[model samples]
Target: XXXXXXXXXXXXXXXXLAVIISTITIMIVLSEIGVNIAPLLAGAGALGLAISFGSQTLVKDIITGVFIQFENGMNTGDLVTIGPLTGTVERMSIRSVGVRQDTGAYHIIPWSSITTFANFVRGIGSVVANYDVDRHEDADKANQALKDAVAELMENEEIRGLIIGEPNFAGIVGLSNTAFTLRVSFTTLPLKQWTVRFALDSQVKKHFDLAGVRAPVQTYQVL
Candidate 1:
């Protein structure tokens, strides 16, 4: 049962405990028989705590089974996988009932299986950057695409940026338009957990490249 429950150690512990209990019980029975003493009431009183433990143990059993199913079904977490379930962080360890996440701010969050609500794996990079303030109003449609692509080229060429990418990213043209600003979308695939690093790197470098190209983006509100 413990094997099926994914707790192999539980089986060994239970077997050892059962054998000890039986040996203790037999010794007690023989000792009581030799002394002609009835300790039934004392034993009965002693069993009440045992009874409470048994009932409480049922709740724990329920927790373990539910936790096991949660772990086996659609569980996508691995070491270094980025997740925002009970806490947002990089996963450092995964156990049957708990997942350990190391926060970007340097704290570790041990999230139990029961409390995990949002388990997210960033499988791909679908990044967005608005180019409204930086884009010249006079540029043609082709020129606008080129400007964004040029910005992406500078981003992808860096060794820090290139190391994270599995495939090269392409500018997906403007997603939405505004009189003042346009949203330049870039979508690509990256190794799992590499999205945030790659994305921020791209955005940071693009801002520098864009400014050099006579385009400007407000560094603070770069909204």
Candidate 2:
């Protein structure tokens, strides 16, 4: 119960401002009771307040933007996002800034007033699309079958199957050239898991290609 109330107070900028105002009033009353002349102090406070208002322009913007973002549920802790210059999961959110821990373990604290745009990767489905090129001499149908077989095999694996959202789609031959033909395979997967599925599918495709004798086009470099 104590922590609950403490967290609530910490989350609300208004509560902190009210506490500061109350403390200032208490100090003024105490000085007045001691028979100190407070009129000049009150007049000086007017100038200080104007300076503070000017100095805290960004501070007010930060708090207001943070409040609106939280209210709109725009992003949340543990969600993967690319906010401003930081691409990471939101590790913490405060009244003035957000703490993000990136994939490389770098931590950043970005003020809410600075976030002009952001992309949330955890809110929807992710897609994994891979294209492969093979020797024109090789059977295009055989290569397509190899890709389909690889994806179908991956779906049987417990770990990979959990990340995939739908059946694998074979896009047939997508490109043709003098030396190679391109084929595409795609999968709809759970957010943030597309890369994992993509890699796993790549490995499977290589294996199936070997078993099926599908030869990839060799890149010949001329010196």
lDDT of 2 by residue, 1-223 (tens): 6577555544552443666576565555445344464775676588679879886866766676666567553455544344444554444444444445554555554454454545454345554455454555455565556566556645656546445454455544455553343334434343545565566566656665665644565567798
> What TM-score would each prediction reach against the true structure?
0.37, 0.51
Report the number of backbone clashes for model 1.
Answer: 1
lDDT of 2 at 81: 46
In candidate 2, stretches whose alpha carbon ends up further than 4 angstroms from where it belongs are 1-54, 57-61, 71-77, 83-106, 113-123, 135-139, 154-157, 160-165, 168-189, 195-199, 211-223
Model 2 global lDDT (CA atoms, 0 to 1):
0.53
Candidate 2: minimum summed lDDT over ten consecutive residues — where? 178-187
Candidate 1 per-residue lDDT, tens place, 111-173, comes to: 343443444444544455544434444445534554555455546554334333332333334
Clash tally, candidates in order: 1, 0
Give Cα distance to truth, residue 91, candidate 2, Å. Answer: 4.2
Q: Would you list the C-alpha lDDT of every candidate in the order shown? A: 0.45, 0.53
